[PDB]
Ligand binder design. Structure first.
Ligand code: HEM
Length: 153
């Protein structure tokens, strides 16, 4: 579990994101899509985007970026007490969008990357440790619900 000190680091770093949610959200999704092009294909909504230039110009991608990060931010602020918030996300991502848990690992990596890129020398080793733990907890609890539903993998 996370200690209170680690949760404080996580939420202090999250304050950087909240200064510019749409910007961080677009940066994270583009990193995901370019690093792991198979993820783009899970989005009928964005499949048409071929180049990074097109992704950067898409206002709808920014809009989904706010939706995604708004949901993740509310979950982090629960400090692990997130059962009610996680349940619908697990259910829709497992049974409707058909997202393997591996992709949740990829986007976790993309978040860490983007934070380093946007905040050089301002994302501490302690904070990276804490964020990593918090995203692992998120994956673990979603994975538990995937396994229930027969989607483990
Ligand atoms: C930090 C992890 C993530 C969060 C917080 C998140 C959150 C959300 C939210 C709030 C929605 C809208 C409501 C819903 O459909 O449940 C959504 C939709 C969706 N998500 Fe995610 N998501 C995450 C990861 C991913 C990943 C890794 C993929 C695929 C590679 C993915 C694929 C999709 C798709 C395809 C939709 C539907 C978009 C549309 O057609 O409007 N999500 N997500």
């Amino acid at each position: 579990v996370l200690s209170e000190g680690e949760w404080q680091l996580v939420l202090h770093v999250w304050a950087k994101v909240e200064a510019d949610v749409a910007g961080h959200g677009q940066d994270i999704l583009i990193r995901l899509f370019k690093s792991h092009p198979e993820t783009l294909e899970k989005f009928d909504r964005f499949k048409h985007l071929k180049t990074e230039a097109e992704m950067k110009a898409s206002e709808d991608l920014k809009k989904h970026g706010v939706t995604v990060l708004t949901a993740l931010g509310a979950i982090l602020k629960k400090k692990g007490h997130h059962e009610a918030e996680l349940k619908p996300l697990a259910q829709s991502h497992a049974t409707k969008h058909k997202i393997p848990i591996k992709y949740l690992e990829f986007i976790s990596e993309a978040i860490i990357h983007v934070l380093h890129s946007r905040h050089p020398g301002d994302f501490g080793a302690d904070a990276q440790g804490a964020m990593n733990k918090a995203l692992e907890l998120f994956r673990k609890d979603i994975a538990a619900k995937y396994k229930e539903l027969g989607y483990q993998g």
